[PDB]
Design a protein around this nucleic acid. Structure first.
Ligand code: NA
Ligand code: NA
Ligand code: NA
Length: 327
DNA sequence: CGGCAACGCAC
DNA sequence: GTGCG
DNA sequence: GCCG
């Protein structure tokens, strides 16, 4: 879908990025949703009233949209802190968010070399810094495929019945991916247990995993690994890789969650909410039991969902293919 | 005005 | 408990 | 920022 409001959305993206790097995530979110709507509008926006009519665009956003449209500029841009470029630079380091970026900036740091030479770094941040360039690039989906096949080969050697699927943007069909998230499970509902640890060991022994950001995270019955991998061969770059092992009964909800996108997951959680349910990476459940003070006193009950279609069905929604889940 | 999800891990 | 993804 |  052609963007008939490019000059507009271009200036709005710069402002949104400013808010995002300085910590105002909620304000940045609002901009991102409004920007999406603009890029996909059938024609160049021509009036404030019309702008206001689009879902996601309120008075404030319409006010800026019309300003750019009629004046060609957005004055709010000329008042952006000069620090934004550096705050984005620092926040591009895996493990370093806005607060850390802010702190380093207040210490006078301005470049990556400054960081490497004078900044205090967590273990995760040091790995993120040393792979700065590799991690900022989006890999061709062809490489993500090789990464997924590598994990799957190691996994299936332990149990040929395991089901492995790369999620994230890869599953949504994008030509390039910022990372690879391999979701692993077993149809018999129990054989996924005792795989996670030895799978990581096997991949580590074979030289595929090069650094661990979080060797193991236990979220209910789900086990997650966050790390760094590199395919064999000269010229290969280091890439971000997550491996998640889950019980079959939660496979559909895990698939949906890790496939995303982050915006799609938000709309689905909100929608589940309007229907007295909650949707997480674990399951689709009925609303939690609350007391006189609207406080969690008892978990809602899990509504079994064998496949993603079941989740949409129970939510009264038409099924949506992964490629259609950017928003 | 408050919600926009909730959570685990590193520190 | 803060920060991060 | 947007929305109820
Ligand atoms: Na600003
Ligand atoms: Na970061
Ligand atoms: Na507010």
């Amino acid at each position: 879908a052609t963007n008939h409001n490019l000059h507009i959305t271009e200036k709005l993206e710069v402002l949104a990025k400013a808010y995002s790097v300085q910590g105002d995530k909620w304000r940045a979110l609002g901009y991102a949703k409004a920007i999406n709507a603009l890029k996909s509008f059938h024609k160049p926006v021509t009036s404030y009233q019309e702008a206001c009519s689009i879902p996601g665009i309120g008075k404030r956003m319409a006010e800026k949209i019309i300003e750019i449209l009629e004046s060609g500029h957005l004055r709010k841009l000329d008042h952006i802190s000069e620090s934004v470029p550096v705050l984005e630079l620092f926040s591009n380091i895996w493990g370093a968010g806005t607060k850390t970026a802010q702190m380093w900036y207040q210490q006078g740091f301005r470049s990556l070399e400054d960081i490497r030479s004078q900044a205090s770094l967590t273990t995760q941040q040091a790995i993120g810094l040393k792979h700065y360039s590799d991690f900022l690039e989006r890999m061709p989906r062809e490489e993500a495929t090789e990464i997924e096949q590598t994990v799957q080969k190691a996994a299936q050697a332990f149990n040929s019945g395991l089901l492995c699927v790369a999620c994230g943007s890869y599953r949504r069909g994008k030509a390039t991916c910022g990372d690879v998230d391999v979701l692993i499970t077993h149809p018999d509902g129990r054989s996924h247990r005792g795989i996670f640890s030895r799978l990581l060991d096997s991949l580590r022994q074979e030289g595929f995993l090069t650094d661990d950001l979080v060797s193991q995270e236990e979220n209910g019955q789900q086990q997650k690994y966050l790390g760094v991998c590199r395919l064999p061969g000269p010229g290969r770059r280091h890439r971000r890789l997550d491996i998640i092992v889950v019980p079959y009964s939660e496979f559909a909800c895990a698939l949906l969650y890790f496939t995303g996108s982050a915006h799609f997951n938000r709309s689905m959680r909100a929608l589940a909410k309007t229907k007295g349910m909650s949707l997480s990476e674990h399951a689709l459940s009925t609303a939690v039991v609350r007391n006189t003070h609207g406080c969690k006193v008892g978990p809602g009950r899990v509504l079994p969902t064998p496949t993603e279609k079941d989740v949409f069905r129970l939510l009264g929604l038409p099924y949506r293919e992964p490629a259609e889940r950017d928003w």
